[PDB]
Amino acid sequence: NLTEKFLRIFARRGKSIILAYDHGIEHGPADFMDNPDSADPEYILRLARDAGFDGVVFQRGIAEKYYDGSVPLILKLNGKTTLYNGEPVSVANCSVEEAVSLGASAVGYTIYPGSGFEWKMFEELARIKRDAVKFDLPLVVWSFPRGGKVVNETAPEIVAYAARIALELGSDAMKIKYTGDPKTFSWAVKVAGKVPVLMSGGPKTKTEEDFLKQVEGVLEAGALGIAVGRNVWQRRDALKFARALAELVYGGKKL
Amino acid sequence: NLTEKFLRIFARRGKSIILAYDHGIEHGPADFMDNPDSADPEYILRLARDAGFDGVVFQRGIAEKYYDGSVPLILKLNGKTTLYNGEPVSVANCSVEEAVSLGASAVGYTIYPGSGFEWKMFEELARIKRDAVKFDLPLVVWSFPRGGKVVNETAPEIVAYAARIALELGSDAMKIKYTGDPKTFSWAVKVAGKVPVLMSGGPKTKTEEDFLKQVEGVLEAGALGIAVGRNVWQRRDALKFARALAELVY
Amino acid sequence: NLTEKFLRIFARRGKSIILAYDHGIEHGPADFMDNPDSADPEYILRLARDAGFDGVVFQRGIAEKYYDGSVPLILKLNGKTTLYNGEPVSVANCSVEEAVSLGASAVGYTIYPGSGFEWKMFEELARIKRDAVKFDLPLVVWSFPRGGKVVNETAPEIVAYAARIALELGSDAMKIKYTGDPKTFSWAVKVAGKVPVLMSGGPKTKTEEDFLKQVEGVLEAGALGIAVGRNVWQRRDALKFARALAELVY
Amino acid sequence: NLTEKFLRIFARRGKSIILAYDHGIEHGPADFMDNPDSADPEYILRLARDAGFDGVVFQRGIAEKYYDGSVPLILKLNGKTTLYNGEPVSVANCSVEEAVSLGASAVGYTIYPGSGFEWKMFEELARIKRDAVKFDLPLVVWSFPRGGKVVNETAPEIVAYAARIALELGSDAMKIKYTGDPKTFSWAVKVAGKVPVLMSGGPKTKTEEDFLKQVEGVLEAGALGIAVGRNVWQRRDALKFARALAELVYG
Amino acid sequence: NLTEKFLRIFARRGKSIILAYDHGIEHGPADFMDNPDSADPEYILRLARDAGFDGVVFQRGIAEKYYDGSVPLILKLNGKTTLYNGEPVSVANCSVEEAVSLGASAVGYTIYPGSGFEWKMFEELARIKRDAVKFDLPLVVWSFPRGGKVVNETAPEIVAYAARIALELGSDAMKIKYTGDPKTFSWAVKVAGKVPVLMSGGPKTKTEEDFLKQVEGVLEAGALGIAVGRNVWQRRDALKFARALAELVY
């Protein structure tokens, strides 16, 4: 059971915080100017360690050149850029077998349900899923409806759809966008059934409190925890704030 | 003879009811709000068993996480979403070999004849068909003409075309839309020949009576049975009504 | 030599009549309304056998469920529908190896020279040709230019082009549309060289005499014979007229 | 060295004449009406043999039904039609391995640099080049820029680009369009470096002398010779003219 | 560690100059009219040697016919032409295995982030990267964002994105456009992390002084060196200028 393996490794305390760092490809280095140290993957590793987080997410080139075994690794297999203008598509730049050699404990893959290319991502995910089972690595799906009829990616019915698709396609854990409230987000958590849900952190919030309140909602809705990037490492007080998130998520008490 | 195998497993009583549950990918969870328990695959398995139905239809993720061997399984290999706006296409997210591993007794695959992508699904069905034969699992084709010249999907000449295409491409059973009346639907059944036909249940009908009436015509047209989702599990009295369907069909 | 093999099997008398029956996918069951018995592949086989024809053409599904070894079989590997609106393209739904297992004595494949997808069909035909040689099964190509700059499919220069292309790509026999007269048709036969040409029967003619006259022209042009569907089995006197065709051709 | 092998087989006399016959697919049989025997591949083989030419170019269907080993064969692996209206593309209908079994002494492949589909041909040529090396058959590239920014295919800078691309991609010999004069054609020959250049014959010229003058310019430019189709087999005096071409190129 | 192997071979003095010569395909022979000896690859090899440069970049055809082992070789695996009008795309015409056989000490590949085809190059670079590791050849990525939203290829944010993408995808060294000043270029150098950066030379500058100032700024920004073509071999005094470059860099 790969969900069980995922939980043992990335959620030993009953909840999970994953430090996300595929941003160098997805958005590029404009994400790193706020807190320049954030451009250094070594800083990101020390940050995940010192904050007591469960994992990091790296693309293959970052894992190859920097990964040191110090925090469990989710190797994000596919990536695209924001420079790209077509219907959304993100293709694997790494195999599951290569992810094993690079020290990963899980693999990650983004799908964009609704895209004119949804078929292209589903077809490749099928091959990656088969390899995840073969190599006994949990498959984590970033499920981000985009393109086609999608006009509001955080609408309740869009996020619930995102969650259900990830279940249906064989994910062992998933990452979806937050709806902005616990009632509608708990519907997504429910339809995902036995597969645990991680909240995608999103653009840096106006205040730290705004983020903490979102995280409380996610936990209220019954999600497993968060896969957070900017709302930690785009902050000059990254470590102090990361520590406050750890206490909220692992501590389990009402703000 | 994989048709014979299909009949032995899924129509031991001479007729067949299959509980369809690929909707979580095809339509998403809005389908589940009318009767919230329907979002739980375990509730679906209990419903199929408790009504004495012949099979269930699951995508790979649902089968992997929930399938317990209690009712025969058709593993639906391809899925698409309603969020998608292109020429209709649905590609495999699972192989026949993996379906075998997940405990499937048959595999399912949707084609959309007429789509700008009709060639992509025919190409893929060729490989899936070859594998179905290799692993001795019946191949059940959902034949749903869509895109291209198709305007009315339930028009009698489209449904009959759907039936013929499924026969021609090598299906061992098929699922097609109802035309709304037994005489026109019996032509589709006729052109399917040796291959048994299941009626796609469709959107929940205004009254329970309306649906029973449709199932009556389906059987009268000589079809094998029904592959039904919403018209059972979107109802709050799902189990009671499923038992009434079992009484009618068998 | 696979042309020689094709002639021994399908032209033992020196000329050939092939009963074509891929219509179920290509046009759908509308083709069967004229003579409803034609929806039944058992009736088609009986018809070919009774009239003394040389072969039958089935898609894989029909061959698998109905072929009984009674008449030599050309397995038509690719198929498309009339519901489809893009640039013309027909992909294989069956392999040469599978066709051999289905009892085929030859394999068939349609190309649409000129189509925006001509590259896709030429690519796939290369694989099929390779397998046809490997399995020693003659390759029969339906060469039907369509799409691109093709305005009139029965223009003398289009049909001759269709014939040359089938020869160049490595067909062992070919099926092409008739130009309407023997003089221009004989140019198409000439440019096909050593590869025998079968006339595509086309839409059912206004009279049985019209068709007989076309067939007479085809023979005068030096063609091997005919691959006929509708002009036989769309007729209520199917057997009688098939026998008059045997008379004329043999 | 496959260029050296190509030269030994197809240019033993120092220059080369190859009789090209892929027209039946590229242009269709209207090319054959002027001289109806030209529709008969047996006639083409006899023509090349009787004129003393170095080779013939056939698509797989023609080689399979007709090739008799009598003249060295270049197996033209890809073909497209003039009925096709999309971005110029021509895909292989035959593998290198099959070409070997059909008697080929070399393989041929057309690319259309500039096409919206140039990537599809480069990707395929890569596989064919790998197989050519594997089976030790020289690879002859018809480098015909077409589509994209290409307007006049015989413009000096286009023909030179065609020549250089064929060198860069790994051709062992190449066939390109003539610019219409020896000075500009010689720059194309130079940028091709160690790879020998054959002139594509083109549409039948107004007079025989017109074509002879073009050939003289091609030879003046330092090209290896000509890959000629229509300017021979479209003529009712095909063999007579073929022998005059042999005298010019080999004398 | 393929970056350390790249550095040992192509940067033994601590900084690198690579003589780039993929122009014959990328731009065609118009690049060669200024200094026509530049059309001869033997002239190019002698130049690199005489100038004391670290390496040369050839496409497979040039390497196969001309490479003599005299200077270390980066085999540039993909190439496209300026004649092409679609969304930028450049596919492999050579495999890593073949590059090994041709005497390559490294392999090169261009990506165009932002292109409507960026996915096609990412998919292919993945197979190339896997082979580079298997054959122990460093992978050098030319990262040139182009198409999509890209309007100024030398903008600070675009060149930094270029650099970071090359690091993310697995390059062992990279080649990127210069931003025109050392401050903005050093940010691209920093985001590349452990992966060394080479400056793409670009079109021939108005004066020798102009190019020298740019090279000075490239070094000031902490880059490894330059991969230069036109700014050396388009000049009549190619060798004199090449040695002035060697004096500055080393």
Ligand SMILES: *[C@@](O)(COP(=O)(O)O)[C@@H](O)[C@H](O)[C@H](O)COP(=O)(O)O
């Ligand atoms: C990237 O942020 C890309 O997401 P989109 O910008 O395309 O919506 C994600 O793949 C991250 O892995 C994930 O969202 C967590 O990072 P964040 O900074 O949002 O917390």
Ligand SMILES: *[C@@](O)(COP(=O)(O)O)[C@@H](O)[C@H](O)[C@H](O)COP(=O)(O)O
């Ligand atoms: C889904 O209903 C999808 O069908 P369309 O909405 O694309 O026409 C089918 O794949 C079902 O498996 C089948 O129709 C039976 O379920 P229903 O709820 O229609 O009875």
Ligand SMILES: *[C@@](O)(COP(=O)(O)O)[C@@H](O)[C@H](O)[C@H](O)COP(=O)(O)O
């Ligand atoms: C189908 O008739 C399809 O032909 P098109 O409608 O696309 O032109 C052919 O593949 C038949 O196999 C062949 O033409 C012979 O049948 P016919 O009914 O025309 O005699």
Ligand SMILES: *[C@@](O)(COP(=O)(O)O)[C@@H](O)[C@H](O)[C@H](O)COP(=O)(O)O
């Ligand atoms: C065909 O002529 C096709 O060329 P395009 O009409 O597409 O330019 C070539 O492949 C010939 O092999 C070559 O041009 C030699 O024949 P020609 O008749 O031109 O002398």
Ligand SMILES: *[C@@](O)(COP(=O)(O)O)[C@@H](O)[C@H](O)[C@H](O)COP(=O)(O)O
């Ligand atoms: C070619 O110059 C292609 O570059 P673009 O014209 O597409 O931007 C490069 O691949 C060169 O290899 C590299 O830029 C070095 O050559 P240069 O002449 O620019 O110094």
